[PDB]
Design a protein around this ligand. Structure first.
Ligand SMILES: *[C@@H]1O[C@H](CO)[C@@H](O[C@@H]2O[C@H](CO)[C@@H](O)[C@H](O)[C@H]2NC(C)=O)[C@H](O)[C@H]1NC(C)=O
Ligand SMILES: *[C@@H]1O[C@H](CO)[C@@H](O[C@@H]2O[C@H](CO)[C@@H](O)[C@H](O)[C@H]2NC(C)=O)[C@H](O)[C@H]1NC(C)=O
Ligand SMILES: *[C@@H]1O[C@H](CO)[C@@H](O)[C@H](O)[C@H]1NC(C)=O
Ligand SMILES: *[C@@H]1O[C@H](CO)[C@@H](O)[C@H](O)[C@H]1NC(C)=O
Lengths: 240, 240
Protein backbone atom coordinates (compact mmCIF):
# COMPACT_ATOMS: atom_id res chain seq x y z
CA UNK A 1 0.00 0.00 0.00
CA UNK A 2 3.04 2.28 0.55
CA UNK A 3 6.38 1.67 -1.16
CA UNK A 4 8.94 4.08 0.38
CA UNK A 5 12.30 2.91 1.72
CA UNK A 6 14.38 5.46 3.59
CA UNK A 7 16.83 5.80 6.45
CA UNK A 8 15.50 6.46 9.92
CA UNK A 9 17.26 9.82 9.79
CA UNK A 10 15.33 10.79 6.66
CA UNK A 11 11.92 9.58 7.95
CA UNK A 12 12.40 11.30 11.31
CA UNK A 13 13.35 14.56 9.63
CA UNK A 14 10.45 14.54 7.18
CA UNK A 15 7.85 13.62 9.84
CA UNK A 16 9.10 16.54 11.88
CA UNK A 17 9.31 19.08 9.07
CA UNK A 18 6.09 18.61 7.12
CA UNK A 19 5.31 22.34 6.86
CA UNK A 20 8.73 23.14 5.38
CA UNK A 21 9.74 22.61 1.75
CA UNK A 22 13.31 21.68 0.92
CA UNK A 23 14.52 21.03 -2.61
CA UNK A 24 16.79 18.14 -3.47
CA UNK A 25 18.58 17.84 -6.80
CA UNK A 26 20.02 14.57 -8.12
CA UNK A 27 21.78 13.91 -11.39
CA UNK A 28 23.11 10.70 -12.92
CA UNK A 29 24.82 10.82 -16.26
CA UNK A 30 26.69 8.41 -18.54
CA UNK A 31 29.15 9.88 -21.02
CA UNK A 32 30.50 7.90 -23.96
CA UNK A 33 34.18 8.68 -24.32
CA UNK A 34 36.89 8.42 -26.91
CA UNK A 35 40.41 9.64 -27.04
CA UNK A 36 42.84 11.18 -29.40
CA UNK A 37 45.83 9.14 -30.56
CA UNK A 38 48.07 11.23 -28.25
CA UNK A 39 46.07 10.50 -25.06
CA UNK A 40 48.05 8.48 -22.52
CA UNK A 41 46.24 6.47 -19.81
CA UNK A 42 45.76 8.40 -16.58
CA UNK A 43 44.18 7.82 -13.17
CA UNK A 44 43.99 11.58 -12.59
CA UNK A 45 40.77 13.06 -11.27
CA UNK A 46 39.91 16.76 -10.70
CA UNK A 47 36.70 17.66 -8.80
CA UNK A 48 35.25 20.99 -7.75
CA UNK A 49 32.02 22.53 -6.45
CA UNK A 50 31.55 26.30 -6.51
CA UNK A 51 28.60 28.53 -5.62
CA UNK A 52 28.24 31.94 -7.21
CA UNK A 53 25.95 34.94 -6.72
CA UNK A 54 25.32 37.43 -9.52
CA UNK A 55 23.33 40.66 -9.17
CA UNK A 56 20.42 40.92 -11.60
CA UNK A 57 20.10 44.35 -13.21
CA UNK A 58 16.35 44.00 -13.63
CA UNK A 59 15.65 42.92 -10.05
CA UNK A 60 16.14 42.96 -6.30
CA UNK A 61 16.70 39.23 -6.82
CA UNK A 62 20.08 37.53 -7.16
CA UNK A 63 21.02 34.74 -9.53
CA UNK A 64 22.41 31.79 -7.52
CA UNK A 65 24.47 29.21 -9.38
CA UNK A 66 25.90 25.97 -8.07
CA UNK A 67 28.55 24.51 -10.39
CA UNK A 68 30.01 21.02 -10.10
CA UNK A 69 33.02 20.23 -12.26
CA UNK A 70 34.85 16.96 -12.78
CA UNK A 71 37.71 16.01 -15.08
CA UNK A 72 38.95 12.46 -15.80
CA UNK A 73 39.70 10.15 -18.76
CA UNK A 74 40.42 13.10 -21.07
CA UNK A 75 36.98 14.66 -20.56
CA UNK A 76 35.86 17.65 -18.48
CA UNK A 77 32.30 17.98 -17.20
CA UNK A 78 30.44 21.02 -15.89
CA UNK A 79 27.02 20.84 -14.24
CA UNK A 80 25.42 24.12 -13.29
CA UNK A 81 22.12 24.55 -11.48
CA UNK A 82 20.93 28.16 -11.63
CA UNK A 83 18.05 29.81 -9.77
CA UNK A 84 16.59 33.29 -9.34
CA UNK A 85 16.27 34.26 -5.68
CA UNK A 86 16.75 30.56 -4.84
CA UNK A 87 20.00 28.79 -3.97
CA UNK A 88 20.28 25.00 -4.23
CA UNK A 89 23.97 24.23 -3.67
CA UNK A 90 25.69 20.96 -4.64
CA UNK A 91 27.33 18.94 -1.88
CA UNK A 92 28.53 15.92 -3.85
CA UNK A 93 30.07 14.96 -7.17
CA UNK A 94 31.28 11.45 -8.00
CA UNK A 95 33.01 10.19 -11.14
CA UNK A 96 33.49 6.63 -12.38
CA UNK A 97 35.99 6.27 -15.19
CA UNK A 98 38.26 3.95 -17.12
CA UNK A 99 41.81 5.34 -17.35
CA UNK A 100 42.65 3.58 -20.66
CA UNK A 101 42.96 4.47 -24.35
CA UNK A 102 39.86 2.59 -25.40
CA UNK A 103 36.38 4.05 -25.76
CA UNK A 104 34.54 3.81 -22.47
CA UNK A 105 31.80 5.27 -20.32
CA UNK A 106 32.41 8.00 -17.80
CA UNK A 107 29.82 8.11 -15.01
CA UNK A 108 28.80 11.28 -13.14
CA UNK A 109 26.69 11.80 -9.98
CA UNK A 110 25.86 15.29 -8.78
CA UNK A 111 23.67 15.89 -5.72
CA UNK A 112 22.59 18.80 -3.53
CA UNK A 113 22.56 18.67 0.26
CA UNK A 114 20.10 16.36 2.04
CA UNK A 115 18.04 18.55 4.40
CA UNK A 116 18.32 15.93 7.12
CA UNK A 117 22.10 16.08 6.99
CA UNK A 118 22.05 19.86 7.01
CA UNK A 119 19.14 22.18 6.48
CA UNK A 120 18.91 23.91 3.18
CA UNK A 121 16.64 26.76 2.15
CA UNK A 122 13.06 26.47 3.20
CA UNK A 123 11.11 27.25 0.07
CA UNK A 124 7.83 27.56 2.06
CA UNK A 125 9.00 30.99 3.20
CA UNK A 126 7.02 33.99 1.92
CA UNK A 127 3.98 32.03 0.76
CA UNK A 128 6.10 29.54 -1.17
CA UNK A 129 7.94 32.22 -3.13
CA UNK A 130 10.93 29.88 -3.52
CA UNK A 131 8.83 27.06 -4.95
CA UNK A 132 7.41 29.35 -7.61
CA UNK A 133 10.86 30.72 -8.46
CA UNK A 134 12.11 27.15 -9.01
CA UNK A 135 9.13 26.08 -11.13
CA UNK A 136 9.31 29.19 -13.25
CA UNK A 137 12.97 30.13 -13.45
CA UNK A 138 15.34 27.24 -12.57
CA UNK A 139 17.99 26.36 -15.18
CA UNK A 140 20.28 23.35 -15.56
CA UNK A 141 23.32 23.69 -17.83
CA UNK A 142 25.55 20.75 -18.65
CA UNK A 143 28.79 21.05 -20.59
CA UNK A 144 31.18 18.28 -21.58
CA UNK A 145 34.52 19.17 -23.08
CA UNK A 146 37.55 17.20 -24.08
CA UNK A 147 40.50 18.80 -22.40
CA UNK A 148 43.31 18.81 -22.31
CA UNK A 149 43.32 16.54 -25.39
CA UNK A 150 44.90 17.58 -28.69
CA UNK A 151 43.32 16.04 -31.78
CA UNK A 152 44.86 15.40 -35.22
CA UNK A 153 44.94 18.52 -37.41
CA UNK A 154 46.17 18.27 -41.03
CA UNK A 155 49.59 20.01 -41.21
CA UNK A 156 49.38 23.68 -42.29
CA UNK A 157 48.86 26.01 -39.34
CA UNK A 158 51.26 24.98 -36.57
CA UNK A 159 50.18 23.51 -33.21
CA UNK A 160 53.19 21.08 -33.02
CA UNK A 161 -1.06 30.17 -12.61
CA UNK A 162 -2.64 26.85 -11.64
CA UNK A 163 -1.04 24.61 -9.01
CA UNK A 164 -0.40 21.05 -10.21
CA UNK A 165 0.34 17.80 -8.37
CA UNK A 166 3.69 16.98 -9.89
CA UNK A 167 4.51 14.14 -7.50
CA UNK A 168 2.39 12.16 -9.92
CA UNK A 169 3.38 14.03 -13.09
CA UNK A 170 6.71 15.91 -12.82
CA UNK A 171 7.26 19.06 -14.84
CA UNK A 172 10.16 19.11 -17.26
CA UNK A 173 13.34 20.64 -15.97
CA UNK A 174 14.73 23.31 -18.30
CA UNK A 175 18.20 22.12 -19.36
CA UNK A 176 20.87 22.62 -21.99
CA UNK A 177 23.42 19.97 -22.93
CA UNK A 178 26.55 21.14 -24.77
CA UNK A 179 29.10 18.50 -25.81
CA UNK A 180 32.32 18.33 -27.82
CA UNK A 181 31.74 15.47 -30.31
CA UNK A 182 35.48 14.89 -30.69
CA UNK A 183 35.62 13.14 -27.32
CA UNK A 184 31.92 12.59 -26.54
CA UNK A 185 30.19 9.76 -28.39
CA UNK A 186 26.99 9.61 -26.33
CA UNK A 187 25.11 11.00 -23.35
CA UNK A 188 22.55 9.33 -21.11
CA UNK A 189 21.14 11.50 -18.38
CA UNK A 190 18.61 11.30 -15.60
CA UNK A 191 17.95 14.35 -13.47
CA UNK A 192 15.39 15.25 -10.81
CA UNK A 193 14.72 18.25 -8.62
CA UNK A 194 12.01 17.86 -6.04
CA UNK A 195 10.71 18.30 -2.51
CA UNK A 196 13.27 16.31 -0.53
CA UNK A 197 10.46 14.92 1.66
CA UNK A 198 8.10 14.23 -1.23
CA UNK A 199 7.85 10.61 -0.07
CA UNK A 200 5.97 11.78 3.04
CA UNK A 201 3.50 14.04 1.23
CA UNK A 202 0.34 13.05 -0.60
CA UNK A 203 0.86 15.64 -3.31
CA UNK A 204 3.40 18.30 -4.21
CA UNK A 205 3.85 21.09 -6.76
CA UNK A 206 7.67 20.68 -6.51
CA UNK A 207 8.79 17.83 -8.77
CA UNK A 208 10.86 18.38 -11.90
CA UNK A 209 12.53 15.80 -14.09
CA UNK A 210 14.92 15.73 -17.01
CA UNK A 211 16.00 12.88 -19.26
CA UNK A 212 18.33 12.49 -22.23
CA UNK A 213 18.90 9.22 -24.05
CA UNK A 214 18.29 6.25 -21.78
CA UNK A 215 17.85 7.94 -18.39
CA UNK A 216 16.51 4.81 -16.74
CA UNK A 217 19.51 2.77 -17.81
CA UNK A 218 22.11 5.21 -16.38
CA UNK A 219 20.14 5.61 -13.15
CA UNK A 220 20.74 1.86 -12.67
CA UNK A 221 24.15 1.19 -14.31
CA UNK A 222 25.72 3.95 -12.19
CA UNK A 223 25.18 1.98 -8.97
CA UNK A 224 27.30 -0.85 -10.37
CA UNK A 225 30.47 0.65 -11.87
CA UNK A 226 32.74 0.45 -8.84
CA UNK A 227 33.71 -3.09 -9.84
CA UNK A 228 35.25 -2.08 -13.19
CA UNK A 229 36.12 1.65 -13.00
CA UNK A 230 38.25 4.11 -11.07
CA UNK A 231 35.98 5.94 -8.60
CA UNK A 232 36.57 9.44 -7.27
CA UNK A 233 34.27 11.72 -5.37
CA UNK A 234 34.16 15.01 -3.54
CA UNK A 235 31.79 15.37 -0.58
CA UNK A 236 31.42 18.79 1.02
CA UNK A 237 31.78 19.19 4.80
CA UNK A 238 28.33 18.87 6.32
CA UNK A 239 28.06 22.43 7.64
CA UNK A 240 29.65 24.30 4.73
CA UNK B 1 43.83 -14.81 23.73
CA UNK B 2 43.65 -13.55 20.11
CA UNK B 3 42.71 -9.96 19.24
CA UNK B 4 42.26 -9.76 15.44
CA UNK B 5 39.15 -8.27 13.82
CA UNK B 6 38.82 -8.65 10.07
CA UNK B 7 36.27 -9.12 7.33
CA UNK B 8 35.30 -12.63 6.33
CA UNK B 9 36.83 -11.91 2.92
CA UNK B 10 40.19 -11.11 4.53
CA UNK B 11 40.18 -14.13 6.90
CA UNK B 12 39.16 -16.53 4.11
CA UNK B 13 41.90 -15.22 1.84
CA UNK B 14 44.64 -15.39 4.46
CA UNK B 15 43.66 -18.90 5.65
CA UNK B 16 43.86 -20.03 2.05
CA UNK B 17 47.11 -18.29 1.14
CA UNK B 18 49.41 -18.96 4.09
CA UNK B 19 52.42 -19.92 1.95
CA UNK B 20 52.25 -16.69 -0.06
CA UNK B 21 53.55 -13.30 1.10
CA UNK B 22 51.77 -10.15 -0.01
CA UNK B 23 52.84 -6.68 1.09
CA UNK B 24 50.36 -4.05 2.18
CA UNK B 25 51.27 -0.40 2.59
CA UNK B 26 49.18 2.07 4.61
CA UNK B 27 49.84 5.72 5.29
CA UNK B 28 47.96 8.26 7.41
CA UNK B 29 49.21 11.79 7.58
CA UNK B 30 48.06 15.09 9.09
CA UNK B 31 49.36 18.29 7.53
CA UNK B 32 49.12 21.65 9.27
CA UNK B 33 48.17 24.25 6.70
CA UNK B 34 48.26 27.99 6.28
CA UNK B 35 47.55 30.24 3.40
CA UNK B 36 48.85 33.32 1.77
CA UNK B 37 46.78 36.50 1.93
CA UNK B 38 45.81 36.00 -1.75
CA UNK B 39 44.39 32.47 -1.26
CA UNK B 40 40.64 32.31 -1.90
CA UNK B 41 38.54 29.47 -0.42
CA UNK B 42 38.17 26.50 -2.74
CA UNK B 43 36.53 23.08 -2.68
CA UNK B 44 38.80 21.90 -5.50
CA UNK B 45 40.51 18.54 -5.19
CA UNK B 46 43.05 16.93 -7.58
CA UNK B 47 44.02 13.25 -7.07
CA UNK B 48 46.31 10.97 -9.02
CA UNK B 49 48.07 7.60 -8.74
CA UNK B 50 50.86 6.69 -11.16
CA UNK B 51 53.18 3.70 -11.39
CA UNK B 52 56.57 4.03 -13.04
CA UNK B 53 59.35 1.64 -14.06
CA UNK B 54 62.94 2.82 -14.44
CA UNK B 55 65.81 0.70 -15.74
CA UNK B 56 68.73 0.45 -13.32
CA UNK B 57 72.12 0.81 -15.00
CA UNK B 58 73.84 -1.34 -12.41
CA UNK B 59 71.36 -4.21 -12.57
CA UNK B 60 68.98 -6.59 -14.30
CA UNK B 61 66.52 -5.22 -11.73
CA UNK B 62 64.03 -2.42 -12.35
CA UNK B 63 63.10 0.39 -9.99
CA UNK B 64 59.31 0.36 -9.42
CA UNK B 65 57.72 3.52 -8.06
CA UNK B 66 54.13 4.08 -7.05
CA UNK B 67 53.28 7.78 -6.67
CA UNK B 68 50.09 9.14 -5.11
CA UNK B 69 49.45 12.85 -5.49
CA UNK B 70 46.71 15.00 -3.99
CA UNK B 71 46.11 18.74 -4.10
CA UNK B 72 43.57 20.68 -2.00
CA UNK B 73 43.40 23.70 0.34
CA UNK B 74 46.40 25.37 -1.34
CA UNK B 75 48.72 22.43 -0.66
CA UNK B 76 50.03 19.67 -2.94
CA UNK B 77 51.14 16.30 -1.58
CA UNK B 78 53.27 13.59 -3.19
CA UNK B 79 53.76 10.14 -1.69
CA UNK B 80 56.14 7.84 -3.48
CA UNK B 81 56.89 4.24 -2.55
CA UNK B 82 59.94 2.94 -4.40
CA UNK B 83 61.29 -0.61 -4.61
CA UNK B 84 64.05 -2.49 -6.44
CA UNK B 85 62.71 -5.50 -8.32
CA UNK B 86 59.52 -5.17 -6.24
CA UNK B 87 56.34 -3.31 -7.19
CA UNK B 88 53.81 -2.30 -4.52
CA UNK B 89 51.28 -0.10 -6.32
CA UNK B 90 48.86 2.30 -4.60
CA UNK B 91 45.14 1.75 -5.14
CA UNK B 92 43.71 4.48 -2.92
CA UNK B 93 44.29 8.07 -1.88
CA UNK B 94 41.86 10.07 0.27
CA UNK B 95 42.05 13.70 1.35
CA UNK B 96 40.16 15.52 4.09
CA UNK B 97 40.41 19.29 3.96
CA UNK B 98 38.94 22.59 5.03
CA UNK B 99 38.38 24.91 2.06
CA UNK B 100 38.74 28.16 4.07
CA UNK B 101 41.34 30.88 4.63
CA UNK B 102 42.11 29.86 8.19
CA UNK B 103 44.89 27.54 9.30
CA UNK B 104 43.66 23.97 9.30
CA UNK B 105 44.64 20.34 9.04
CA UNK B 106 44.73 18.47 5.77
CA UNK B 107 44.36 14.71 6.15
CA UNK B 108 45.88 12.13 3.76
CA UNK B 109 45.36 8.35 3.43
CA UNK B 110 47.37 6.35 0.94
CA UNK B 111 47.00 2.57 0.64
CA UNK B 112 48.18 -0.22 -1.65
CA UNK B 113 45.90 -2.96 -2.97
CA UNK B 114 44.44 -5.51 -0.53
CA UNK B 115 45.47 -8.96 -1.81
CA UNK B 116 42.01 -10.30 -1.09
CA UNK B 117 40.45 -7.68 -3.36
CA UNK B 118 43.01 -8.37 -6.06
CA UNK B 119 46.21 -10.33 -5.84
CA UNK B 120 49.39 -8.39 -5.71
CA UNK B 121 52.94 -9.65 -6.06
CA UNK B 122 53.78 -12.77 -4.17
CA UNK B 123 57.02 -11.95 -2.42
CA UNK B 124 57.56 -15.63 -1.48
CA UNK B 125 58.68 -16.25 -5.07
CA UNK B 126 62.34 -17.16 -5.60
CA UNK B 127 63.09 -18.03 -1.98
CA UNK B 128 61.57 -14.80 -0.70
CA UNK B 129 63.67 -12.60 -2.96
CA UNK B 130 60.95 -9.92 -2.87
CA UNK B 131 60.85 -9.82 0.92
CA UNK B 132 64.59 -9.24 1.10
CA UNK B 133 64.43 -6.54 -1.58
CA UNK B 134 61.78 -4.70 0.47
CA UNK B 135 63.65 -5.00 3.78
CA UNK B 136 66.90 -3.87 2.23
CA UNK B 137 65.97 -1.42 -0.50
CA UNK B 138 62.43 0.01 -0.13
CA UNK B 139 62.14 3.83 -0.06
CA UNK B 140 59.29 6.14 0.92
CA UNK B 141 59.46 9.77 -0.24
CA UNK B 142 56.93 12.35 0.89
CA UNK B 143 56.78 15.87 -0.49
CA UNK B 144 54.40 18.66 0.49
CA UNK B 145 54.34 21.83 -1.53
CA UNK B 146 52.22 24.92 -1.49
CA UNK B 147 50.96 25.43 -5.00
CA UNK B 148 49.63 27.25 -6.67
CA UNK B 149 49.89 29.85 -3.89
CA UNK B 150 51.79 33.12 -4.32
CA UNK B 151 53.27 34.55 -1.13
CA UNK B 152 54.14 38.18 -0.27
CA UNK B 153 57.48 39.29 -1.75
CA UNK B 154 58.85 42.77 -0.93
CA UNK B 155 58.57 44.91 -4.11
CA UNK B 156 61.76 44.93 -6.23
CA UNK B 157 61.84 42.06 -8.72
CA UNK B 158 58.44 41.85 -10.41
CA UNK B 159 56.00 38.94 -9.98
CA UNK B 160 52.87 41.24 -10.05
CA UNK B 161 71.93 -11.46 7.31
CA UNK B 162 69.86 -12.67 10.27
CA UNK B 163 66.09 -13.12 9.96
CA UNK B 164 64.10 -11.23 12.61
CA UNK B 165 60.51 -11.52 13.83
CA UNK B 166 59.31 -8.03 13.04
CA UNK B 167 55.64 -8.73 13.72
CA UNK B 168 56.68 -8.08 17.29
CA UNK B 169 59.33 -5.45 16.55
CA UNK B 170 58.91 -3.71 13.16
CA UNK B 171 61.95 -2.41 11.32
CA UNK B 172 62.07 1.28 10.51
CA UNK B 173 60.89 2.23 7.07
CA UNK B 174 63.40 4.39 5.20
CA UNK B 175 61.64 7.69 4.45
CA UNK B 176 62.28 11.30 3.52
CA UNK B 177 59.88 14.14 4.30
CA UNK B 178 60.30 17.37 2.32
CA UNK B 179 57.97 20.27 3.13
CA UNK B 180 57.55 23.91 2.13
CA UNK B 181 57.34 25.80 5.47
CA UNK B 182 55.46 28.68 3.86
CA UNK B 183 52.25 26.64 3.77
CA UNK B 184 53.13 23.69 6.03
CA UNK B 185 53.10 24.33 9.77
CA UNK B 186 53.26 20.71 10.97
CA UNK B 187 53.32 17.07 9.94
CA UNK B 188 52.07 14.02 11.79
CA UNK B 189 52.58 10.74 10.03
CA UNK B 190 51.99 7.07 10.60
CA UNK B 191 53.10 4.57 7.99
CA UNK B 192 53.32 0.78 7.83
CA UNK B 193 54.37 -1.75 5.22
CA UNK B 194 53.85 -5.37 6.12
CA UNK B 195 52.68 -8.86 5.24
CA UNK B 196 49.02 -8.24 4.43
CA UNK B 197 48.10 -11.47 6.26
CA UNK B 198 50.40 -10.86 9.22
CA UNK B 199 47.41 -11.26 11.54
CA UNK B 200 47.25 -14.96 10.62
CA UNK B 201 50.94 -15.69 11.11
CA UNK B 202 52.79 -16.33 14.35
CA UNK B 203 55.88 -14.46 13.19
CA UNK B 204 57.02 -12.55 10.12
CA UNK B 205 60.18 -10.87 8.81
CA UNK B 206 58.01 -8.41 6.79
CA UNK B 207 56.89 -5.56 9.04
CA UNK B 208 58.13 -2.00 8.61
CA UNK B 209 56.91 1.13 10.33
CA UNK B 210 57.47 4.86 10.08
CA UNK B 211 56.37 7.68 12.35
CA UNK B 212 56.77 11.46 12.39
CA UNK B 213 55.38 13.70 15.10
CA UNK B 214 52.33 12.15 16.75
CA UNK B 215 51.69 9.13 14.51
CA UNK B 216 49.25 7.55 16.93
CA UNK B 217 47.13 10.69 17.06
CA UNK B 218 46.75 11.00 13.25
CA UNK B 219 46.03 7.28 12.89
CA UNK B 220 42.96 7.96 15.07
CA UNK B 221 41.91 11.55 14.18
CA UNK B 222 41.81 10.60 10.48
CA UNK B 223 38.85 8.25 11.01
CA UNK B 224 36.79 11.16 12.35
CA UNK B 225 37.23 14.13 9.98
CA UNK B 226 34.29 13.50 7.67
CA UNK B 227 32.05 15.47 10.03
CA UNK B 228 33.97 18.75 9.66
CA UNK B 229 35.98 18.57 6.40
CA UNK B 230 35.52 18.19 2.66
CA UNK B 231 36.36 14.58 1.73
CA UNK B 232 37.66 13.43 -1.64
CA UNK B 233 39.15 10.14 -2.66
CA UNK B 234 40.34 8.20 -5.65
CA UNK B 235 39.94 4.41 -5.64
CA UNK B 236 41.48 2.43 -8.50
CA UNK B 237 39.39 -0.12 -10.41
CA UNK B 238 39.86 -3.48 -8.74
CA UNK B 239 41.61 -5.21 -11.64
CA UNK B 240 43.84 -2.35 -12.83
C1 LIG C 1 26.62 7.35 -7.88
O1 LIG C 1 25.80 7.35 -6.72
C2 LIG C 1 25.28 6.06 -6.41
C3 LIG C 1 24.41 6.19 -5.19
O2 LIG C 1 23.23 6.80 -5.64
C4 LIG C 1 26.42 5.12 -6.09
O3 LIG C 1 25.90 3.87 -5.70
C5 LIG C 1 26.56 2.92 -4.82
O4 LIG C 1 27.43 2.18 -5.67
C6 LIG C 1 28.19 1.21 -4.95
C7 LIG C 1 29.29 0.66 -5.86
O5 LIG C 1 29.36 1.41 -7.06
C8 LIG C 1 27.24 0.13 -4.39
O6 LIG C 1 27.90 -0.94 -3.70
C9 LIG C 1 26.19 0.81 -3.50
O7 LIG C 1 25.18 -0.10 -3.16
C10 LIG C 1 25.51 1.98 -4.21
N1 LIG C 1 24.66 2.71 -3.29
C11 LIG C 1 23.34 2.79 -3.47
C12 LIG C 1 22.62 3.73 -2.55
O8 LIG C 1 22.72 2.16 -4.33
C13 LIG C 1 27.38 4.99 -7.27
O9 LIG C 1 28.56 4.39 -6.78
C14 LIG C 1 27.78 6.38 -7.75
N2 LIG C 1 28.53 6.30 -8.97
C15 LIG C 1 29.64 7.02 -9.07
C16 LIG C 1 30.45 6.88 -10.33
O10 LIG C 1 30.01 7.77 -8.17
C1 LIG D 1 41.17 7.53 5.89
O1 LIG D 1 40.87 6.15 5.94
C2 LIG D 1 40.06 5.79 7.05
C3 LIG D 1 39.83 4.30 7.01
O2 LIG D 1 41.05 3.73 7.42
C4 LIG D 1 38.72 6.48 6.94
O3 LIG D 1 37.89 6.06 8.00
C5 LIG D 1 36.44 6.03 7.98
O4 LIG D 1 36.03 7.35 8.32
C6 LIG D 1 34.62 7.51 8.30
C7 LIG D 1 34.28 9.00 8.40
O5 LIG D 1 35.45 9.78 8.27
C8 LIG D 1 34.00 6.64 9.43
O6 LIG D 1 32.58 6.77 9.56
C9 LIG D 1 34.42 5.18 9.22
O7 LIG D 1 34.08 4.40 10.33
C10 LIG D 1 35.93 5.04 9.03
N1 LIG D 1 36.28 3.68 8.66
C11 LIG D 1 37.04 2.91 9.44
C12 LIG D 1 37.47 1.61 8.83
O8 LIG D 1 37.41 3.22 10.58
C13 LIG D 1 38.88 8.00 6.92
O9 LIG D 1 37.66 8.54 6.48
C14 LIG D 1 39.91 8.39 5.86
N2 LIG D 1 40.23 9.78 5.95
C15 LIG D 1 40.26 10.48 4.81
C16 LIG D 1 40.53 11.96 4.92
O10 LIG D 1 40.07 9.95 3.72
C1 LIG E 1 37.51 21.85 -20.58
O1 LIG E 1 38.86 22.30 -20.51
C2 LIG E 1 39.25 23.34 -21.40
C3 LIG E 1 40.74 23.64 -21.25
O2 LIG E 1 41.05 23.73 -19.88
C4 LIG E 1 38.44 24.60 -21.19
O3 LIG E 1 38.86 25.62 -22.09
C5 LIG E 1 36.97 24.24 -21.35
O4 LIG E 1 36.17 25.37 -21.09
C6 LIG E 1 36.60 23.09 -20.40
N1 LIG E 1 35.20 22.76 -20.56
C7 LIG E 1 34.40 22.46 -19.54
C8 LIG E 1 33.09 21.83 -19.90
O5 LIG E 1 34.68 22.65 -18.35
C1 LIG F 1 53.33 21.60 -6.15
O1 LIG F 1 52.96 22.38 -7.28
C2 LIG F 1 54.00 23.11 -7.92
C3 LIG F 1 53.44 23.95 -9.06
O2 LIG F 1 52.56 23.16 -9.83
C4 LIG F 1 55.10 22.20 -8.44
O3 LIG F 1 56.12 22.96 -9.08
C5 LIG F 1 55.63 21.39 -7.26
O4 LIG F 1 56.60 20.47 -7.71
C6 LIG F 1 54.47 20.65 -6.58
N1 LIG F 1 54.98 19.87 -5.47
C7 LIG F 1 54.55 18.65 -5.16
C8 LIG F 1 54.94 18.14 -3.81
O5 LIG F 1 53.86 17.95 -5.91
Amino acid sequence: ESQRSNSEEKANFCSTHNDEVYARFRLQMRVGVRHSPLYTPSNMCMLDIEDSVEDIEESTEKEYASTATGEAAGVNVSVALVGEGVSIPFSYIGLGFNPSLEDSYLYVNVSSRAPWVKQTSDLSANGGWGIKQVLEKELLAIQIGCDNQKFPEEPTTTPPGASVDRKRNPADIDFSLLVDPRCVTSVDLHVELRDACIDYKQESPLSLKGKYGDGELVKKEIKDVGKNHNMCSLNLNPGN
